[PDB]
């Protein structure tokens, strides 16, 4: 407009706050020992 | 075998070959030479 720039401000809701969220727990790995070596058999449900 | 007085006898020693390896898996009409583990050595994430 051109009459008057009668301006003001209003609040944005839905801000980004902290919180606790639930994450998957991967399938358990199989740890076969060996002399100065660990061996891991892994079977992911999802990209891990 | 015997037809009209003849006696026919076939074999042996057809080169003693087989494709069928010692361990076979059958699925949907298809046959595979997999090294399947015995009953009680099957591990998770594997056939057995």
Swiss-Prot record, chain A:
PTM text: Palmitoylated via thioester bonds. These palmitoylations may induce disruption of the C-terminus transmembrane. This would result in the reorientation of E2 C-terminus from lumenal to cytoplasmic side.
Subcellular location: Virion membrane; Host cell membrane
Bilayer topology term: Single-pass type I membrane protein
Record-annotated site: Interaction with host receptor LDLRAD3: 17
Record text on subunit structure and interactions: Interacts with spike glycoprotein E1. Processing of the precursor of protein E3/E2 into E2 and E3 results in a heterodimer of the spike glycoproteins E2 and E1. Spike at virion surface are constituted of a trimer of E2-E1 heterodimers. Interacts with 6K protein. Interacts with host LDLRAD3 (via domain LDL-receptor class A 1); this interaction mediates viral entry to the host cell. 2 adjacent E2-E1 heterodimers in the trimeric spike interact with host LDLRAD3.
Function field: Plays a role in viral attachment to target host cell, by binding to the cell receptor LDLRAD3. Synthesized as a p62 precursor which is processed by furin at the cell membrane just before virion budding, giving rise to E2-E1 heterodimer. The p62-E1 heterodimer is stable, whereas E2-E1 is unstable and dissociate at low pH. p62 is processed at the last step, presumably to avoid E1 fusion activation before its final export to cell surface.
Name of the protein: Spike glycoprotein E2
Organism: Venezuelan equine encephalitis virus (strain TC-83) (VEEV)
From-to range in the entire protein, with total length: 580 to 627 of 1254
From Swiss-Prot, chain B:
Modifications made to the protein after synthesis: N-glycosylated.
Compartment annotation: Virion membrane; Host cell membrane
Topological type in the membrane: Single-pass type I membrane protein
Function, as annotated: Class II viral fusion protein. Fusion activity is inactive as long as E1 is bound to E2 in mature virion. After virus attachment to cell receptor LDLRAD3 and endocytosis, acidification of the endosome induce dissociation of E1/E2 heterodimer and concomitant trimerization of the E1 subunits. This E1 trimer is fusion active, and promotes release of viral nucleocapsid in cytoplasm after endosome and viral membrane fusion. Efficient fusion requires the presence of cholesterol and sphingolipid in the target membrane.
Self-association and partners: Interacts with spike glycoprotein E2. The precursor of protein E3/E2 and E1 form a heterodimer shortly after synthesis. Processing of the precursor of protein E3/E2 into E2 and E3 results in a heterodimer of the spike glycoproteins E2 and E1. Spike at virion surface are constituted of three E2-E1 heterodimers. After target cell attachment and endocytosis, E1 change conformation to form homotrimers. Interacts with 6K protein. Interacts (via fusion peptide loop) with host LDLRAD3 (via domain LDL-receptor class A 1); this interaction mediates viral entry to the host cell.
Protein name in UniProt: Spike glycoprotein E1
Residues of the full protein shown: 966 to 1013 of 1254
């Amino acid at each position: 407009a051109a009459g008057a720039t009668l301006k003001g401000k209003l609040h944005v809701p839905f801000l980004l706050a902290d919180g606790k969220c639930t994450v998957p727990l991967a399938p358990e790995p199989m740890i076969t020992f060996g002399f100065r070596s660990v061996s891991l058999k892994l079977h992911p449900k999802n990209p891990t | 075998v015997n037809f009209n007085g003849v006696k026919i006898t076939a074999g042996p020693l057809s080169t003693a070959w087989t494709p069928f390896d010692r361990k076979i898996v059958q699925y949907a009409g298809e046959i595979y030479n997999y090294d399947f583990p015995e009953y009680g050595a099957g591990q998770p994430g594997a056939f057995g």
